[PDB]
Amino acid sequence: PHIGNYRLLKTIGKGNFAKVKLARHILTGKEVAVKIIDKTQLNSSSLQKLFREVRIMKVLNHPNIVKLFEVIETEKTLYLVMEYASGGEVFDYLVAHGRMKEKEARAKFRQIVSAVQYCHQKFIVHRDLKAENLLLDADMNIKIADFGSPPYAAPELFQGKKYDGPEVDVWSLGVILYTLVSGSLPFDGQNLKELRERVLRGKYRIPFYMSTDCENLLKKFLILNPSKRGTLEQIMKDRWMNVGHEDDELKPYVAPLPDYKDPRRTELMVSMGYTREEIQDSLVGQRYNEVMATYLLLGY
DSSP: OEETTEEEEEEEEEOSSEEEEEEEETTTOOEEEEEEEEGGGOOHHHHHHHHHHHHHHHHOOOTTBOOEEEEEEOSSEEEEEEEOOTTOBHHHHHHHHOSOOHHHHHHHHHHHHHHHHHHHHTTOOOOOOOGGGEEEOTTOOEEEOOOOOGGGOOTHHHHTOOOOSHHHHHHHHHHHHHHHHHSSOSSOOSSHHHHHHHHHHOOOOOOTTOOHHHHHHHHHHOOSSGGGSOOHHHHTTOHHHHTTOTTSOOOOOOOOOOOOOOHHHHHHHHHTTOOHHHHHHHHHTTOOSHHHHHHHHHTO
16 A cells, blocks of 8 residues: 555554554655545544644654654644654563663663753653653664653642643653662552552662662652652753763753755755755655655664
8 A cells, every 4th residue: 555655664652542554655665654645534642642742753853753744634634754763662672671771771861851851942841751651762762752651750740730841751760760769660560549659658668688778769769749850951960870981961952053055965856856946845844745855864
């Protein structure tokens, strides 16, 4: 099967809203994931969420966040063509391998905090961070996807408080660190009442093998009072974050300047029948149309 410039290759995920296909971009030979969504089956708040996610995916350009290449819209169906993360979930990788040693946890968690802090720079709060969101590419770099949830919920959820700011992401990141280094959850329960009591007390077991550096970092995430949690920019300076990185302290990600006029890709594209003007207009306009997709995909 063909849609746009994509040969669909195999189903890699199937829910009730969406199918995900592995595809090949015909013009470049590039492998992509295509989320196919039947809009006719979606209710109003699911449509709200889909349009918000599309808006967020267009804006995020970070090496540890699933890149968008194209949005194709029909009346009935929406297709989101995005970066394929072929290494599975961090979740599956923990169940399969055991806890990560702190040095490996740190390599992944530096990428995670960088990605999330970059979202916050842009006033985007994820709000639903969890194990399933953390994918791996072929080199086991983190790719956060998608814009098992109760274990990650900040205490304000069960207090009936507002559940709004970046500080909610800061609490979930503490839960992710804990699960990376221990392979289990800090707050668990046989049911929700059990889970809630634990989250609200804020106390977790310290595994015997955990370093004091790592336990001191968890204490900067897992703060019960929302307005007392530090920013990710402040937490990037933590000692554990930077063990083995004396030369490069973790800092807020700065994205490269736009390069929209690359003569190599533009020449290839004029050959395909695109005009220089529409290549420029599409890129400046961040249109995510076929012309923009082809330019981005030629960049691999």
